[PDB]
Nucleic acid binder design. Structure first.
Lengths: 149, 453, 567, 53, 61
RNA sequence: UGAGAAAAGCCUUCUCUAGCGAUC
């Protein structure tokens, strides 16, 4: 008679050393893995519940303006540089990474109605209630020199 | 000029195994917006099935076999002839523990084939790794024991004592004494739901959630004493045998049985189903062994009359069927490729020291566990165990850290009790009655003197 | 864990199934390849990583590629190269990239990567490898040369090799090796242009572009040897002899007052009637040396001339010697000659049976350097050859001049001569004076020769008297006791008590570190007829405790071999 | 955000290339591990040139 | 079994194998068994059920 | 406090850091 029985070689299935990681053979036979529909539904249900647990959208709030914020302009070249304008007439430049204000300039008298950044990123344009269109330099004034358009 | 230009083909039968679409459906669609989604769905299915076909080569083991020569019958071949002709590793798996001072033993294998636990009628409870010859625990409850089962990993085991239900650690420490489950005859665990089902003498079927520790359901069978019980691993339903000759299908959600199937002209004493959930094996007092097709037909595929009575039945992962009649066990073998086992002539035979009280196949080994009055024996059954196991589901060679990672994943993925139905894919179909209720609401918002008479 | 390994095995599957399509490999062979590939893959995806696992992975894939290459020729199937070979090569390139990223400092891994890229990879992939090499290893001039070498000899791009060389000199401005190879490379470019013209500008074809390298390199590196070296490559190229002519003329004009330039001109003139013609060339080379002497009178120039006389004599012989003897005298009066070269001539004169000039060299050496003891040994050997009866006065004059007491070869040499041609008592007197003068470790050889003389001049009784007197002078050697044991063995008595008595004294002095002495003692108890073999148990027990460190392990191995027949 | 940084050390000059980084939230508790952990730092930063003294 | 992580605890809250107070009241019972050494759990049940009968009689009276 | 208290030897379950791994 001819007889064979399953005989797993232990060296194949057990790692050689303590430094080695465990060997994990995988079989994709559907008979071994039943309930494919109900099991996956629970995982999807758990995924939605975990999404509501970790929903924390608020990051930071920037303060320093002395009237309502009216205009916003982002910088084309840098992610962390943004420009804002308040109703009192001042324009502030913010650092998003440091969450602080870099510069403050008194651009106009009254509201500032619009602000746009030149595509190169070395200047911006502001408009106020004083019937004035002003161009400024994005680089900060040197030392304590007062800023001029 | 390349003789064979095309890519490598994959077997159609192998791809069909990794397939979950109903091609028989002839639904008509006349809209391109419907058409685009459908073709993508077929495209997604075909590519996944092809990849698994190539992965068949990664399988490294082969199932065992045993065939005679010069017309000899495999039934007359004894275990001693097998042991001398098989390697030293498998020969060590055949042993005969002799414990007759205690009562007849009921045995259970863990879901991973590494661990075995057994319980005696007189109250001997012991758990051990059976591959190596070491004893995890060995205790003697003063009360009688009717059934023994494992709960998920080897850490927890449940015994059905004479009065109540008790839970023990793998080292022998008593954890729970459940007084609601009383006079329980049979125990069996649903793995993917973490529910333990109990059959009691009073006639009640109770479901207990071991993960949380609360009883989800308690059902009155209203059929008298309950002593024959089994589950369908594919279906997750519970089968109950009765003296009427009928088998009742049960789920924790319903207060009434899902179905009743009349199988015998007398009382049924054994029931067993295959792992795939296709075939059902029953035996009764009319000395008839029956095989039923559970896939919507519920007709007896095969019938055979037996000299003695088959007290117990079991199914392996490859489809072998074993019947325990008195002190003699008989195994029937069939090709199993979309076919039931052949009852024409048995495959192997063996005679025990005492009458058989429990049968089970080891999950991923070619051995059979038999519990009887004399003690516990382990047979060698070539071709019964499934060769290639999955390392992430049931790894015999898993470390403690691997085991604890798997347990959390299973606990994250526990299936609620109410989802158990006759169809494991019942969640996929659209609720048709809820469709028409919604449609109703949608519609809602959207001769001359004869005239004197 | 096994998810990445599983991804890589499923990536490896399609070429394996195509190979099964070919008929090149059988299904069991594919199974074995899959098994070994998984085994090798598991090693390199661990948290702890070693280089040898990467090396084994690369070697296994190379062996598989070679096996496929051998089998394709036998089958005759040349289709589907891209499906299999390119995939394997891409995987090996990924493995090499990961290994090189992990271990940047290992040059050998980089060179193995370069070799594999040369053998199996596209030329642009090899081009990317050199840039990665030179980016972090720019401080090694040899790596610059290898990159430039590949561009010229393989890629045939002279322009690329020029920029690699020019950039290399900016990192290493003072490397002479870089200049010489850059000088060679441009001359190689000129030959390719000469061969280009014959198949179908003038200035480079003359070798002018190499001449610009010559002038600048000389200015940066002001060395004669580097200047001569550029001429060596220049002579190697047959074309543009004028370039060799220009370099050769600048040798004497620019580089003067250094001996090497005058030597090169002498050897350049060097390169029965033929022997007369050969003899004629020698004087012309000899003649040039004197103007070198007259212009440059330094000592270092003088050795280059006397040595030149030496090989010609060792390489007619009378005429060669006549040159050597005169130039020796000329150097001797000027006293510029140093100590070492006096010996080399005199030792040379002894070997060719001419014994009179050697005496004059010996006398001149002693007069110039009286204190040198090596000269006095050198003179002594001459008169032993000459057999003149002036040996006795030589010892009197040498030791008087040698004020330092430690003259070990002289004390030895006096012993053998006194034995040969002097009475027995005077030989003993010389030995006793030697032991008084030499007190340190040099007395070890003195005592051994004293004991050997006693056995020869006298008998066993004379050796016993000398051994008893010298047994307490602690500076010893194992040869002292081994010689005395041999003398007892040769005598007919062979008193075993004396044999044991000599071994105990030797084991007292050197038993802590000498494994051979203990093993020799044990074999005496077994092999000797008067020995007691039952004592060997105690000798082995005593040997282990006194021996220290590796000597203890040596005795075990030697005894284990002695128990077997290997001894 | 691909850019090159010049780092000067006592041993020599090093030139390095940065592939990607979360710029805005860099100074935050969770994103800071990108530069602190050596394995994550190797993911986004490579050594393209080194010139020792 | 392992110490649950912060995300795991939210999904696997109220899961505890050893303590099932609502079902068997084992922790409360264990204190009674240890304080007065009771060989069998059944003896405690008879005392508890009989105690209910005494109290039920008093409330009805 | 009340499986009294105290001391030794074996298994079981689990907790912290620290390197290491993510560069193809």
């Amino acid at each position: 008679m001819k007889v064979k029985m399953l005989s797993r070689n232990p060296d194949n299935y057990v790692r050689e050393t303590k430094l080695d990681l465990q060997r994990v053979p995988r079989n994709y036979d559907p008979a071994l893995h039943p309930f494919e529909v109900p099991r996956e539904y629970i995982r999807a249900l758990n995924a939605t519940k975990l999404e509501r647990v970790f929903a924390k959208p608020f990051l930071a709030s920037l303060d320093g303006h002395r009237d309502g914020v009216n205009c916003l302009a982002k910088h084309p070249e840098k992610l962390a540089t943004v420009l804002s304008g308040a109703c009192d007439g001042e324009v502030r430049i913010w650092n998003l990474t440091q969450r602080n204000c870099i510069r403050t300039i008194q651009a106009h008298e009254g509201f500032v109605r619009g602000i746009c950044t030149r595509f190169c990123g070395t200047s911006f344009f502001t408009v106020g209630d004083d019937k004035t269109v002003k161009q400024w330099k994005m680089d900060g004034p040197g030392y304590g020199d007062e800023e001029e358009p | 000029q390349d003789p064979f230009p095309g890519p490598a083909p994959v077997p159609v039968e192998v791809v069909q195994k990794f397939c979950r679409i109903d091609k028989s459906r002839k639904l008509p669609h006349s809209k391109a917006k419907t058409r685009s989604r459908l073709e993508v769905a077929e495209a997604e299915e075909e590519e996944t099935s092809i990849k698994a076909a190539r992965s068949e080569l990664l399988l490294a083991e082969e199932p065992g076999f045993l065939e005679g020569e010069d017309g000899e019958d495999t039934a007359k071949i004894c275990q001693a002839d097998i042991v001398e002709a098989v390697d030293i590793a498998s020969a060590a798996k055949h042993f005969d523990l002799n414990l007759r001072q205690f009562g007849p033993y009921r045995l259970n294998y863990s879901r991973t084939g590494r661990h075995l636990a057994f319980g005696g009628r007189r109250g001997h409870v012991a758990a051990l790794d059976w591959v190596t010859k070491k004893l995890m625990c060995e205790i003697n409850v003063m009360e009688a024991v009717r059934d023994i089962r494992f709960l998920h990993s080897e850490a927890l085991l449940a015994v059905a004592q004479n009065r109540w239900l008790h839970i023990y650690d793998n080292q022998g420490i008593e954890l729970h004494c459940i007084r609601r489950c009383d006079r329980v005859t049979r125990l069996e665990f649903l793995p993917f739901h973490f529910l333990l089902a109990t059959a009691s003498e009073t006639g009640f079927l109770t479901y207990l959630d071991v993960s949380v520790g609360k009883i989800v359901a308690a059902l009155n069978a209203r059929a008298g004493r309950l002593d024959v019980m089994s589950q369908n691993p594919y279906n997750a339903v519970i089968h109950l045998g009765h003296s009427n000759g009928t088998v009742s299908l049960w789920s924790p959600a319903m207060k009434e049985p899902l179905a009743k199937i009349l199988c015998h002209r007398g009382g049924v004493r054994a029931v067993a189903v295959d792992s795939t959930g296709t075939y059902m094996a029953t035996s009764g007092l009319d000395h008839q062994l029956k095989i039923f097709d559970l896939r919507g037909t519920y007709q007896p595929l095969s019938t055979r009359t037996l000299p003695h009575g088959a007290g117990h039945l079991a199914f392996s992962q490859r489809g072998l069927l074993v019947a325990g009649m008195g002190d003699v066990v008989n195994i029937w073998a069939g090709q199993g490729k979309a076919s039931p086992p052949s009852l024409e002539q048995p495959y192997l035979t063996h005679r025990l020291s005492g009458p058989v009280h429990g049968l089970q196949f080891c999950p991923f080994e070619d051995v059979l566990g038999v519990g009887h009055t004399g003690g516990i024996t382990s047979m060698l059954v070539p071709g019964a165990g499934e060769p290639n196991f999955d390392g992430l589901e049931s790894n015999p060679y898993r470390s403690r850290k691997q085991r604890q990672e798997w347990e959390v994943k299973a606990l994250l993925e526990k299936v609620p009790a109410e989802l158990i139905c006759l169809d494991p894919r019942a969640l996929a179909e659209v609720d048709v009655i809820s469709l028409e209720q919604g449609k109703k609401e949608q519609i809602e918002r959207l001769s001359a003197l004869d005239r004197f008479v | 864990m096994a998810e990445i390994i599983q991804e890589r095995i499923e990536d490896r599957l399609p070429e394996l199934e195509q190979l099964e399509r070919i008929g090149l490999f059988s299904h069991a062979e594919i199974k074995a390849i899959i098994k070994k590939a998984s085994d090798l893959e598991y090693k390199i995806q661990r948290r702890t990583l070693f280089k040898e696992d990467f090396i084994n992975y690369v070697q296994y894939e190379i062996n598989l590629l070679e096996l496929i290459q051998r089998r394709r020729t036998r089958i005759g199937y040349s289709f589907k190269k891209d499906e299999i070979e390119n995939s394997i090569v891409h995987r090996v390139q990924g493995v090499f990239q990961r290994a090189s990223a992990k271990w940047k400092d290992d040059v050998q891994l980089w060179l193995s990567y370069v070799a594999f890229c040369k053998k199996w990879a596209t030329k642009t992939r090899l081009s990317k490898v050199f840039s990665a090499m030179l980016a972090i290893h720019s401080n090694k001039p040899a790596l610059w040369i290898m990159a430039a070498k590949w561009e010229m000899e393989d890629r045939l791009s002279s322009e690329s090799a020029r920029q690699l060389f020019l950039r290399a000199l900016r990192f290493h401005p003072e490397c002479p090796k870089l200049y010489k190879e850059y000088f060679r490379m441009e001359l190689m470019h000129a030959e390719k242009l000469r061969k280009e013209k014959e198949e179908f500008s003038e200035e480079i074809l003359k070798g002018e572009l190499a001449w610009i390298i010559y002038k600048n390199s000389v200015s940066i590196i002001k060395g004669a040897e580097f200047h001569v070296s550029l001429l060596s490559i220049a002579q190697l190229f047959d074309f543009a002899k004028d370039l060799q002519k220009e370099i050769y003329d600048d040798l004497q004009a620019l580089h003067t007052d250094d001996p090497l330039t005058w030597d090169y001109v002498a050897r350049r003139e060097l390169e029965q009637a033929k022997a007369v013609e050969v003899g004629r060339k020698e004087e012309r080379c000899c003649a040039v040396y004197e103007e070198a002497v007259k212009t440059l009178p330094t000592e270092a120039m003088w050795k280059c001339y006397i040595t030149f006389c030496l090989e010609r004599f060792t390489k007619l012989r009378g005429k060669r010697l006549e040159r050597t003897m005169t130039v020796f005298r000329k150097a001797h009066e000027l006293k510029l000659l140093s100590e070492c070269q006096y010996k080399q001539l005199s030792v040379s004169l002894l070997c060719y049976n001419f014994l009179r000039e050697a005496l004059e060299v010996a006398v001149a050496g002693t007069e110039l350097f009286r204190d040198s003891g090596t000269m006095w040994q050198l003179k002594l050997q001459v008169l032993i050859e000459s057999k003149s009866p002036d040996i006795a006065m030589l010892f009197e004059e040498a030791f008087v001049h040698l004020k330092p007491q430690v003259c070990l070869p002289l004390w030895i040499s006096w012993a053998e001569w006194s034995e040969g041609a002097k009475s027995q008592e005077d030989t003993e007197a010389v030995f006793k004076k030697a032991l008084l003068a030499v007190i340190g470790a040099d007395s070890v050889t003195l005592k051994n020769k004293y004991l050997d003389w006693a056995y020869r001049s006298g008998g066993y009784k004379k050796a016993r008297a000398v051994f008893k007197s010298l047994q307490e002078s602690r500076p010893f050697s194992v040869d002292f006791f081994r010689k005395m044991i041999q003398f007892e063995k040769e005598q007919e008595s062979c008193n075993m008590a004396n044999i044991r008595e000599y071994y105990e004294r030797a084991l007292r002095e050197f038993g802590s570190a000498d494994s051979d002495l203990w093993m020799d003692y044990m074999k005496e108890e077994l092999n000797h007829p008067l020995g007691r073999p039952e004592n060997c148990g105690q000798i082995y027990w005593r040997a282990m405790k006194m021996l220290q460190g590796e000597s203890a392990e040596a005795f075990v191995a030697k005894h284990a071999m002695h128990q077997t027949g290997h001894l | 955000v691909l850019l090159h940084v010049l780092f000067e050390h006592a041993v020599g000059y090093a030139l390095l290339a940065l592939k990607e980084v979360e710029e805005i939230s860099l100074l935050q508790p969770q994103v800071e591990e990108s530069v602190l952990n050596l394995g994550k730092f190797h993911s986004i930063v490579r050594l393209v040139a080194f010139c020792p003294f | 079994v392992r110490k649950l992580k912060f995300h795991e605890q939210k999904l696997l809250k109220q899961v505890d194998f050893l303590n099932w107070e609502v079902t068997d009241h084992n922790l409360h019972e264990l204190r009674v068994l240890r304080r007065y050494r009771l060989q069998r759990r059944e003896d405690y049940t008879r005392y508890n059920q009989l105690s209910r009968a005494v109290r039920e009689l008093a409330r009805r009276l």
